[PDB]
């Protein structure tokens, strides 16, 4: 049973007349049983989209080149550069102090302009993705020989043949709310780093970086990584504000991550509401041995595994007695009707009273001391 591999588990049982059951959460496990039926474990395995939509690209490190400066004397008009009307450039117009000392006929303010071509460094890009509601995959799995059923809006019902156990509706509209989420993917390198983050839409749009849409050549607001120095006569420096990776990652401290499987972008949170259509004798006492000796489960119960070497299938004669009275079974069985099957069976979970008890499985025995509350 898959639900014996984790504590996150629910239990559903169908009575006489129940041929259907109704909210899976991503990463859980539901054990479903029913009158005259085999036991199945059901869970929401994955929520994802292959090749999701992109919003903005942001640049973390400006690639500045071809710095040019033009200047004029106080009454020689305005200074000008070709780059002021070109794309992919950042320019600043200012005024410097001109006079006889720096080759002007007059003393006063002189027009000056500095331009630089602003590109973006390789692998210094940050892409935000969003999900398309008609392309989100909800994959659910069932096991007794595991089978898989994936769901989408135009295909919400799948019938599975469970190997040899007979045959067994997930509403995609009853799943995850992805209205304000953007998946943040940086380029790759820096030794190692998360492949993606889950950030709020507002926060993403307010990112103070150069930005563009996929396929564009020129970066918008490229001046966000450019600092112009003070004007000095006929000069004015263009400075780079540096690599913003560290800045960003600090902003991402405390933020939830996501996952990229090649082309498939996975959520780390979610659920789906579904509807499922659902359509012995005693074990030889002398043939049990311990596979895993009775031990503390970690959640206030006792667990064990046994190996049985008699006729299969059969029902396990498990009981426990407290030191003091060997007539009365003190085992509160959590594993209902423990049974050895042809392919599986043998795991038992029980709860015992505080004190020195003896656990029995057929004639196989083991002492167990239960701690008080």
């Amino acid at each position: 049973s898959r639900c014996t591999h984790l504590e996150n588990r629910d239990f559903v049982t169908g009575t006489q007349g129940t041929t259907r059951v109704t909210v899976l959460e991503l990463g859980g496990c539901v054990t479903i049983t029913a009158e005259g039926k085999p036991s199945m474990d059901v869970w929401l395995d994955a929520i994802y989209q292959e090749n999701p939509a992109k919003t903005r690209e942001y640049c973390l490190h400006a690639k500045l080149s071809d710095t040019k400066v033009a200047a004029r004397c106080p009454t020689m008009g305005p200074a000008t550069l070709a780059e002021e009307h070109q794309g992919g450039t950042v320019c600043k117009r200012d005024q410097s102090d001109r006079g006889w000392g720096n080759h002007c006929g007059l003393f006063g303010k002189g027009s000056i302009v500095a331009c630089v071509k602003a590109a973006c460094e390789a692998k210094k890009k940050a892409t935000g993705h969003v999900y398309d509601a008609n392309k989100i995959v909800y994959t659910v799995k069932v096991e007794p020989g595991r089978k898989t059923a994936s769901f989408t809006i135009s295909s919400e019902k799948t019938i599975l043949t469970m190997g040899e156990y007979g045959d067994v509706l997930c509403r995609v509209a009853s799943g995850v709310d992805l209205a304000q989420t953007v998946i943040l993917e940086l380029d790759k390198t820096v030794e190692h780093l998360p492949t993606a983050w889950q950030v709020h839409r507002d926060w993403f749009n307010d990112l103070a970086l150069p930005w563009k849409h996929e396929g564009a050549q020129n970066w918008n607001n490229a001046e966000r990584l450019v600092e112009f120095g003070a004007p000095h006569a006929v000069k004015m420096d263009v400075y780079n504000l540096g690599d913003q990776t560290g800045v960003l990652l600090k902003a991402l401290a405390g933020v939830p991550v996501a996952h990229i499987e090649g082309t498939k972008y996975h959520l780390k949170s979610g659920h789906v509401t579904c509807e499922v259509g659902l359509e012995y004798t005693m074990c030889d006492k002398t043939k049990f041995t311990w596979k895993r000796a009775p031990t503390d489960s970690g959640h206030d119960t006792v667990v064990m595994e046994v190996t049985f070497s008699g006729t299969k299938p059969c029902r396990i004669p498990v009981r426990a007695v407290a030191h003091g009275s060997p007539d009365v079974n003190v085992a509160m069985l959590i594993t209902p009707n423990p049974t050895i099957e042809n392919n599986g069976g043998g795991f038992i979970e029980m709860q015992l009273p505080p004190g020195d008890n003896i656990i029995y499985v057929g004639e196989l025995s083991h002492q167990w001391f239960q701690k008080g509350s």
Partner: antibody, heavy 120, light 108 residues
Framework: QVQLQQSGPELVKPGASVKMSCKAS????????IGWVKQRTGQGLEWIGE????????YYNEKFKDKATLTADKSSNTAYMQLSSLTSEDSAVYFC?????????????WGQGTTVTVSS | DIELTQSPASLSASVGETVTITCRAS??????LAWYQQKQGKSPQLLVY???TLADGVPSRFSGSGSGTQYSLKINSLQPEDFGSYYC??????????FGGGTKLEIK
């Protein structure tokens, strides 16, 4: 009275296979385990394996897990042991024997034995 | 696995006397050990099961005994039909249901 009737002796060459039978007479076939035991000439007894004919459940000694295969036919009350790829090491008397399904604590009835001789 | 060591390996004794053979289990077999008698070229017969219970048809002079890991079989007033090979075996907890090597009992 309970009787386990085994098949006749086999003389086969190396690499050949034999299939021997055990027929149950005088008891409810499916309520008892059939166990197979090897005995080389003048040697001890060695447990091979066994089958619970009411459910088809089998157990095999690791030593013979690839040598022997056990089957059983409920309708004729007959169990079978088939021995594959024989060598001189398989020359021996093979016994079938009865055990109580549910309290399997002894082999209380034994067949007469099927002798297998592997030879040049 | 369980190993069953039989002791003595062999012994020679005469009619009317008493002999005792033993079977030592490498691990605890909770008294699920049976004894079988085998004559030359014949099929094994069940004598004792569950350490000390005689099988149907077996003479009172056969005493099954012991416990835990040390078992024994004692034969009072040996008769001619008692001579043969004696085997112990065990059906506890998990296979293989190993046998002992056997004790060989003969006349004088």
């Amino acid at each position: 009275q309970v009787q386990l009737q085994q098949s006749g002796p086999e003389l086969v060459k190396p690499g050949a296979s034999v299939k021997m039978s055990c027929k149950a007479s005088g008891y409810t076939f499916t309520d008892y385990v059939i166990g197979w035991v090897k005995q080389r000439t003048g040697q001890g007894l060695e447990w091979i394996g066994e089958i619970y004919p009411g459910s088809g459940t089998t157990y095999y000694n690791e030593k013979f897990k690839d040598k022997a295969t056990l089957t059983a036919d409920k309708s004729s009350n007959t169990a079978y042991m088939q021995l594959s790829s024989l060598t001189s090491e398989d020359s021996a008397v093979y016994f079938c024997a009865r055990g109580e399904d549910g309290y399997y604590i002894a082999l209380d009835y034994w067949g007469q034995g099927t002798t297998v001789t592997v030879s040049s | 696995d369980i190993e069953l060591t039989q002791s003595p390996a062999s012994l020679s004794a005469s009619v009317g006397e008493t002999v005792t053979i033993t079977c030592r289990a490498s691990g605890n077999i909770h008294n699920y050990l049976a004894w079988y008698q085998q004559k030359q070229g014949k099929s094994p017969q069940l004598l004792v099961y569950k350490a000390q219970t005689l099988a149907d048809g077996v003479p009172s002079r056969f005493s099954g005994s012991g416990s835990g890991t040390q078992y024994s079989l004692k034969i009072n007033s040996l008769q001619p039909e008692d001579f043969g090979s004696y085997y112990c075996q065990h059906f506890w907890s998990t296979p293989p249901w190993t046998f002992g090597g056997g004790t060989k009992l003969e006349i004088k």
